[PDB]
Amino acid sequence: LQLLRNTRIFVSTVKTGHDTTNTQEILVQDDISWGQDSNSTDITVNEAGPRPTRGSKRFNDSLNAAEWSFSTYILPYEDTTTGKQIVPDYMLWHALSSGKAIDLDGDTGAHNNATNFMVNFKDNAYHELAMLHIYILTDNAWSYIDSCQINQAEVNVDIEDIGRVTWSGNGNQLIPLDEQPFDPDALGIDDETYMTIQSSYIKNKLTILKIKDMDSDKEYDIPITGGTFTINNNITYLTPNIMSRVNIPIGSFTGAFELTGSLTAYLNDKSLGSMELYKDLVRTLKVVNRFEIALILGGEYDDERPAAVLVAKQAHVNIPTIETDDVLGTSVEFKAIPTDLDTGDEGYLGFSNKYTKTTVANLIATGDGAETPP
Amino acid sequence: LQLLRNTRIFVSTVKTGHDTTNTQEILVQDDISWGQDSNSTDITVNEAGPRPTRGSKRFNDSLNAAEWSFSTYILPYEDTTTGKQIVPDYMLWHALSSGKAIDLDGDTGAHNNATNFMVNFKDNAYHELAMLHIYILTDNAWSYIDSCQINQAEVNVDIEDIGRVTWSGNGNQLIPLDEQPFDPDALGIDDETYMTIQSSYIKNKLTILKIKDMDSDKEYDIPITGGTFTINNNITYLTPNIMSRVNIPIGSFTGAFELTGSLTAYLNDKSLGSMELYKDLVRTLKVVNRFEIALILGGEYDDERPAAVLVAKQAHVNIPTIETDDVLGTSVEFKAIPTDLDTGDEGYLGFSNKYTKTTVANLIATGDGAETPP
Amino acid sequence: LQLLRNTRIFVSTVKTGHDTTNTQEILVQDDISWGQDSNSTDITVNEAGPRPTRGSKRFNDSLNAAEWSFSTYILPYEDTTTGKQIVPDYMLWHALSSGKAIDLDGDTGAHNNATNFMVNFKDNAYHELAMLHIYILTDNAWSYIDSCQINQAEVNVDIEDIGRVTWSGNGNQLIPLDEQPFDPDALGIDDETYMTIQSSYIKNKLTILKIKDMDSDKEYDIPITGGTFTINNNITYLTPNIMSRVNIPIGSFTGAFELTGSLTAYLNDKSLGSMELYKDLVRTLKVVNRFEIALILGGEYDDERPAAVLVAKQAHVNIPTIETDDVLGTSVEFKAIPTDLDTGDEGYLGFSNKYTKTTVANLIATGDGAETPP
Amino acid sequence: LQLLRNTRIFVSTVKTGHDTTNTQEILVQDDISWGQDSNSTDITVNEAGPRPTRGSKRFNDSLNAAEWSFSTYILPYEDTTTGKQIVPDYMLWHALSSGKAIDLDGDTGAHNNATNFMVNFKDNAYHELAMLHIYILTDNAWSYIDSCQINQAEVNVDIEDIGRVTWSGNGNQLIPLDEQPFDPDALGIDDETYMTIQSSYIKNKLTILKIKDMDSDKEYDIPITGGTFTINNNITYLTPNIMSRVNIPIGSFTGAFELTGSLTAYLNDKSLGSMELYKDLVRTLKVVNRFEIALILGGEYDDERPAAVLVAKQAHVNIPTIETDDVLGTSVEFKAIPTDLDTGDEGYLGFSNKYTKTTVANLIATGDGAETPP
Amino acid sequence: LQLLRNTRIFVSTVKTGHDTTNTQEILVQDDISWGQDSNSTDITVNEAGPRPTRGSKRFNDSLNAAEWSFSTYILPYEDTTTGKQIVPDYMLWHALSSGKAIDLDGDTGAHNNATNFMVNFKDNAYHELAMLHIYILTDNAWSYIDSCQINQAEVNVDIEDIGRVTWSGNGNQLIPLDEQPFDPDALGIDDETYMTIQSSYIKNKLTILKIKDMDSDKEYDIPITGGTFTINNNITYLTPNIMSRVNIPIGSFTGAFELTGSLTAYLNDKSLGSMELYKDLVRTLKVVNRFEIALILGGEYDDERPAAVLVAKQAHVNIPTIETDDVLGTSVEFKAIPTDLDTGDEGYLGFSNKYTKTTVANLIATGDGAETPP
């Protein structure tokens, strides 16, 4: 009874009218997790007398926001309906992108064209976010998260493992369901889709890094040894306290979302190498420098190959550190910084199965490698 | 010199007149531990001048309460003298039971009859407790703990390991002894006793759980995957501070003693199963529910078999949690709650080598399975 | 003194009242083995000083479960008392079948009728098993195993050697006996029985295999080159650790028993041949397929002939492998899988001296080839 | 049906357009091997209750990389088309040489001229390698390995046996074929070729060794007793884990390829003999020495004779060992070391049917014995 | 060149002033072995980039302790100079006996008198041992081990083969020598010595065993089927790690030396036979029993005959085991145990060419069979 991965996961914008447009099934890894916790309070009495007592009574106070998390592979493929690049989980990317309706052609948040899929953060600064719903399925059992919201996404550029993304978020409540709400197989993925998928994996070790200085126009060639980057949202949940009858969270505040990254490499002695960058950074000692950072997951080729691209137009670089690893490991940490307070952040995320270096240049320049850049 | 387990342990009510009635030897496991610590204080001076100095002098301040702990197996057997069930370590059970004299027939605290041994907490709420003495013996060496008091007892219902109990407590001081105080072998256990013992072990995996709702009279069948329960006392030690000549603890306060427990199981889809209980608990959301909990260590049979029983007449159940184990592990936590402030707690602990299911029903109903229950 | 095979073996349900009903002598092969081992622990001291020392003292800790094993031929014959097929060693088959009393007519576990002998696993899932006793006899000497339990049985379908079974198990202790406990010859086999036996051997090379697909209703004809199958129980022994006076095992846990098998053949190019099965299995790549497997040890005939039958109603087949043997050897591995968690496994084992193909069909269909199948 | 060596082996760069230029048949020895394996996972449940259960279900997880291996003789002969030395299996030598297109005249990787055939490792450091295809043929049956890559090559310089090479590699999958893909005889070898071949065998026992010190310019004469050398690649295969529907390897990483060797001899007392080398090596104790090593398989002559040559320009020699063989056997182990991290390794491998000592000197000096060395 | 056994072996206390008193030649068997090994470490780099590399450089790290071992026959004979029994290899026996100077009359370690040669372990517990030197000689070549120390000695009491001892040890370094250091023939054995030797061999099959119980004063007669015993030292070598210039061992720690033994026999049914001992040992189950064990290699006679004696005054016997050999083989294992931590071990080893049973009794009683025992 109740085998582990017989669970299946669906995400929906609304709780009724499920179809291939408002609902989507997503592939999941092994370590999927979800749960819901409650607060407790112990009260006891202490007395100075001849006949000491105990009596103590704890009471349930309230419910914490239900937690959920999983991981999935990066997976671009062409939709036969529109002839455009798309990923199975693009609903959640839109949810993280903005708190308004889906429009994959309006260029805001998440969008696509015949060549590639792009994600930006132009219209995300809200007090709330696009409210979604997560449905979990087991053998003859259903459950779902009410009013789930995404909080944190992380990507680890490993040297050996396949590229993946890890997602975590919270919701108001976890509730089981009495019956089957919608078709488990009609709205799911299909065999020919997965046949196209089997060629869309990212060959992780080919990932390449590019750096450019915004002060002296200097550039460096930096071989790398893996790293990470992370987008956060700092969600918070509000809760009134009528503890005489238990309380439930009523809403959420979207704090300041964040984008950070970290890189590792060897200290290399070469022209415009890691040694030169390290010396420049040490001698600089400026309060605020500016740099442009490009990560090409899967590498790049003159031909059409699968790849993903992370772009930072204004990232400020911290002072690097040297470790005692076997061969002189070096580490660098960087943050996203928008130009002035209210303007857009780095934003540009790109994914496709057919990037070429020329298209990569356009994608870096404008956030879209398809059309002619200025 | 000084082989490890050549240590032997005795417990006595008084320091003189040792015999089989006021002293008892108990079997011990490998990980027995004991020790005594002291406090220290460092004083130093800092000066703003041309000739900086150091001088610093630490002083011994006081002694902390000596700590001791060990573990032993649950072990019921019939005493040939009285024809009643008894355990070798029933002195310490009485000590935890009440702060007054031993009476195994007064039904208060610890008692027994021809069928089984029972322990209750009717008369334990004191500012102190029954003061005992622990003697430790090594090859040609003796030591003892002055005014030891029990604090914490824990029982782990494991799926595979034999049932055991772990005991920890404190005392005023640890003092070595110059000579042999009392006979090491005359007051110890004997061979025929241990021959009877070898059949008194508890076959742990047979342990069974029963739950009953006090609101809707509902009951559930819950297969389990091990768990724990714990009794605490929250002892505290008082100490005046004449640090010009070192200090020693002078007495103890018995805080609020406690009884808690935790259980684990699989999410099972069956009538009155774990799924039904989980749904009821989630939908309930009441501040204070009430339940009756029965643990039968060793299981039960219509025939006479060795077993132990833990009874909770009023335990309140917390909201259960679901883990990401290989097959949908679920966890439940519960506490003992007395009816109103000053009345007796759950209390009922039962042990014997010959429980039957009919006797188990009476034991659950009244705390004694021998006589006719109402 | 003490010639080797002058040993004789008896098995009994109880230690007293030995007769032809509760005790049975079984034929044994040459390689019979039995023994009992003990654990040891070495303690030593290391010191940093000018006068280094040695002293080290090992102590006996406990006894491991006594091991025993042997082998015997498959041997069906008709009992003149009941007019039903029976095997000399059917006590141990019942012991492996269930942990309750013998009933060769209740159809549970092991049973028989006027035509054949059957064994099933309907009522075997216990924490323990039917506790038996093994007596070994040598010239003027007796010994016995206390509380022996069967663990593992293996059958090797060889191309040339006679069919045989190999049995291994464990017990609490091995104990010699001071005198002759029961008649060595009155309860043993008799000459006329063995005269009937001499015709009951299995002509091993005639063994045949049948396979049926549960998805496409497909069947194949597979000539074979020998193989094996094995039933396991994963017994475990529990032992408290009072090492100051040596310990002895007190009980056993029956783990998950198991049924597995392996087959070998040549890659044959024929309609519904091994090549076709190999291609189907390679192209399938399904997570869980289902198949029905029939082994007929001794082959089958339209006439009455001696044979044994192994039936797997739901066996899942692993991906076969190809070896570099002289002519393209191929290997297949399979496991027993019950329908859902708690239901009965494959179970059906059949033995007789007079199987016919029509009776074989009924035996495959229902587990009993005597009565009319549905 | 299906006789053993009626198998024939072909290697192709592409799956279509088979001819004498993109496909080649190679001679094989007896012990050719190939296979493909799959992973399995067993899940079971353990419960503490009165009605213990079993149910366990294994699931197929994924496929391991298909393994293949064989051996063949070293075989140089002159091609009538180009008038240059060539070996039948030079496709696989090119595959091991580099991951780019064939060019037997560009001097990179594998090349040749009118005198001899050479192999180098100048352009092999890639993340992948030249992807080839292996076709295996049996009587009325075809199979092939998809995306096979070479991993390991070994050569054993035996005293008595003919020189041979052993090759092992892996591929994505093993797939049978429904029909005959290409002509089995038109693209194979021809009779006159084999008539030329019968004179191209290497008389193994004539193999000679030369050693030169790079520190003191010292040289030694070392009679040898056989040995080995090995080239490795440390290939690795990547595999996503969607185990709800089985997985297949998607790509490979080329690790660090390697070249090592080992030699054996007698301890000989002579000027510049093995004794002198042993004494020098023992007294040296330097961290990194440098040596030049030459192996001439088949020996050398002033006349034109068949031979092969292994050259190590920078090999570092480990400390030799002495064995207890009948006459004072001694063993030496050596590794290839490039000058600095990124430069070319030893590389130089030479093969021909007409080496002369003067040509051997040029081959040692430059890696090509045909043109005038500097 | 360099014939195998033309090697000769000498042992010396010091490296200069070689004579018949500080140097001795010993007979050796065929399988003599010696060698010296070194450690290696491989370092490699892995990079995630477009132009992957290899470069790897191993470095020599340090030298392990040189190993050496051989075997020789037990060989007592009378020295004409002192008129006392002596063995050719008594230097190494003294070395194993103690770490101080030789004194064959001080009764400590190794000593002798006019009747026999004795070895004890009274003064051996040191951090080091008597440092010796081993010289190996071949045709026109010399080598030696620097600071060799004995570690392990083994004796196999075989039924058919002549008695022998096997010795193994380690040293700091193995170094060849440029010239002849000392006379190879003047310090060696002489012809008349070997003429006396030819009568000093031990007729192995006559070896006898005696056992006595230290609890009930019981004794048994045990015919035996061979066995072994072993003395160990657990030497360890220390080594600093300056790997930038290679390291060499600088010293050794003598761990806990050890004495163990194992015996085999048939299960014999006789008064005080092996059956009785087996029953007593099985029923005993005591943690620590005590026994006295006597091995007489070569047997004993009322007349003067060559023999050796091993004495264990306090050996503790493990639980014996029964094997499936052709006739009921039984095995027993025993260890040496000193009385309390720091006192002397069994120690008593005796050798002579003229033991008599009466002298054997005295040797067992006191460790010396010559003088009058108490």
Residue numbers in the entry:
A (entry chain D), B (entry chain D), C (entry chain D), D (entry chain D), E (entry chain D): 3 to 376
Which sentences did the original study use to describe this structure?
The T5 family of viruses are tailed bacteriophages characterized by a long non-contractile tail. The bacteriophage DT57C is closely related to the paradigmal T5 phage, though it recognizes a different receptor (BtuB) and features highly divergent lateral tail fibers (LTF). We present a composite map determined by electron cryo-microscopy (cryo-EM) at resolutions ranging between 2.9 Å to 4.9 Å of the entire T5-like phage particle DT57C, and atomic models comprising its core structural proteins. Our results provide a complete atomic structure of a T5-like phage, provide insights into the process of DNA ejection as well as a structural basis for the design of engineered phages and future mechanistic studies.
The tail of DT57C is composed of 40 stacked rings of tail tube protein (TTP), with each ring containing three subunits. The tail has helical symmetry and 3-fold rotational symmetry, with a rise 41.8 Å and twist 39.5°. While the local resolution of our reconstruction at the flexible Ig-like domains was too low for de novo model building, a predicted structure fitted the molecular envelope well. The tail shaft structure of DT57C is nearly identical to a previously published T5 tail tube structure. To better address tail flexibility and curvature of the segments, we performed asymmetrical reconstruction without imposition of any symmetry, which clearly revealed the presence of TMP inside the tail. Thus, the overall TMP organization within the tail tube of the phage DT57C can be described as a three-stranded parallel coiled coil, with α-helical secondary structure at least at its N- and C-termini (in accordance with secondary structure prediction).
